[PDB]
Amino acid sequence: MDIILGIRVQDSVILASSKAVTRGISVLKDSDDKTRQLSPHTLMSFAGEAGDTVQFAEYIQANIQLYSIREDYELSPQAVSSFVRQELAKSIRSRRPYQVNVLIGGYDKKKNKPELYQIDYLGTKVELPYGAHGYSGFYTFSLLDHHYRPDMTTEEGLDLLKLCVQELEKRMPMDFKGVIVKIVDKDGIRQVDDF
Amino acid sequence: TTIVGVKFNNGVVIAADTRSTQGPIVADKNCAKLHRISPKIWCAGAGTAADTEAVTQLIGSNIELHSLYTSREPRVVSALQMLKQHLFKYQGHIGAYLIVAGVDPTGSHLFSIHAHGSTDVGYYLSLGSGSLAAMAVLESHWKQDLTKEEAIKLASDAIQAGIWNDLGSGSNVDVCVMEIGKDAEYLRNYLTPNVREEKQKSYKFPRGTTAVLKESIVNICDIQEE
């Protein structure tokens, strides 16, 4: 597992995913993304098992967009979150295990509030003001709790998140070559090339 | 857990404890292990509690179906052979040890059925973990033909041997006496030991002695005109 962090800013969810990809004992690629935009206003990032991740990630974009075009309106992040939960839930009971840990972040323009969710591999939905999975989670959960405020502007959320990046690099025995940053906001889903 | 099933001349008498355990902790000092296949064919169960109660419900429903379909009172075997068949299907991944006893027009019966699909017949049988302690008193005191009043004193004092010597057995002693061509009498709490003593003071606390954080009301009433 690698880098995958969320922080719920006042008006947006800032997700970040690892560049490094190691399958075997050699880093093979190092600019890869681990995120696929579900809908115009919901982004989903994933990490977990190799090769399970790539397939199952394509699977959710497909199904949620199937329903989007049926109703010419887009599901709320709460509603997409529940769908992802539903599926993985059937999958720990089922014959072949999936193992995908997801942060689903979206801006709901109908509740008018950014929403951030953490779905672990077991199938537990939880609303959170910051989140994380795996190895990274262990150093950052406490680091983000320290400095946070309830309402923080967007560029404050970036500065904080770059403190969390910077810290991680020292402490983790793994190498991740910096993150890719994406903001999901009310004005659309964009990237920041600043790392 | 001592559950005895003792035949006597005019019927069969079945007794039980009511202490139901889950490992070193006593979950509940009051449930009953006695179930009702049918109105005059009582059964009790021992071993994994879930797998007794569900097997007794499951097959309970089907002998009552049948009993309407013949328009006749159920027989002990009817219940007994359905049991046998069912537990065998999973190959004893179900763990039931039930005493099935009862009367009917064609006489008194008493079987025991183990978790694989084995079945035995005697005139005094016992299941449970305390079973051993029952059995000792049973083999000395018993004799061929008892009366009803004698049969309930043998039954009760056999569970009490159980209580004293087997940790997992305690609480009240229930009885259900089944006697051919008269209704079946449930004598709950026949003889009750293991009365808890009064506390040395009470532990009642006054208001506000635990902190509160905030208050709201939850509204469980249906949605109505505002």
Partner: protein, 229 residues
């Protein structure tokens, strides 16, 4: 590395007013196969203590010699205590206990259950227990092997609690041991008809009735059993 090879089961015991009654089954088993019959296992050690040892025949035989050697060891000099107060059940007991303790250290323990019961020079009943676990506890009624969840319930009727010992004579005590043996013979597969009853009375010594059978057997109902259908 210790595993029982040839096994014995069941020695039972209780107190009464002037002494104790210790009695045991006789049978050298090899599981299912009953290969040895008439196996003595009430080992008289002194004459005011019987040690009844159970478990592996091999392990008992090898600590049977240490018991005899203990009585020799005491008897060395001492002209007012070479047979006059050399022995009490209690002394003999401690010694058994810590030898087994030290063999469990090795982890090739002497595989046995041991009851030591006799009557002291205070007129005090004595009845304690040691085993291959090496737990040490006194008890007013006690049992071993397969009787240690069979015979124990029966005997607790007589002996509800610690005040019922002075009521209980040597005539009631005979009766309880007899009844217990019957029941062991029926429900245990390791048991047998032949048992030996010793009374260690303080006023009549080691009274050893040898080669008792069980009596008044009930097998009348057994012809009334039929099919399952």
């Amino acid at each position: 590395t210790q595993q029982p090879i040839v096994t014995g089961t069941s020695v039972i015991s209780m107190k009464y007013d002037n002494g104790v009654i210790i009695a045991a089954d006789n049978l050298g088993s090899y599981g299912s196969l009953l290969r040895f019959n008439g196996v003595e296992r009430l080992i008289p050690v002194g004459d005011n203590t019987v040690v009844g040892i159970s478990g592996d025949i091999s392990d008992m035989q090898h600590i049977e010699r240490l018991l005899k050697d203990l009585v020799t060891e005491n008897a060395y000099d001492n002209p007012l205590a070479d047979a006059e107060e050399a022995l009490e059940p209690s002394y003999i007991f401690e010694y058994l206990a810590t030898v087994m303790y030290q063999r469990r250290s090795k982890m090739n323990p002497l595989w046995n259950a041991i009851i030591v019961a006799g009557v002291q020079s205070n007129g005090d009943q004595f009845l304690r227990y040691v085993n291959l676990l090496g737990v040490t506890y006194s008890s007013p009624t006690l049992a071993t092997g397969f009787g240690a969840h069979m015979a124990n319930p029966l005997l607790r009727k007589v002996v509800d609690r610690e005040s019922d010992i002075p009521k209980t004579t040597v005539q009631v005590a005979e009766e309880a041991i007899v009844n217990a043996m019957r029941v062991l013979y029926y429900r245990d597969a390791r048991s047998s008809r032949n048992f030996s009853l010793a009374i260690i009375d303080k006023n009549t010594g080691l009274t050893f009735k040898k080669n008792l059978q069980v009596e008044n057997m009930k097998w009348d109902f057994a012809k009334d059993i039929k099919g399952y259908g």
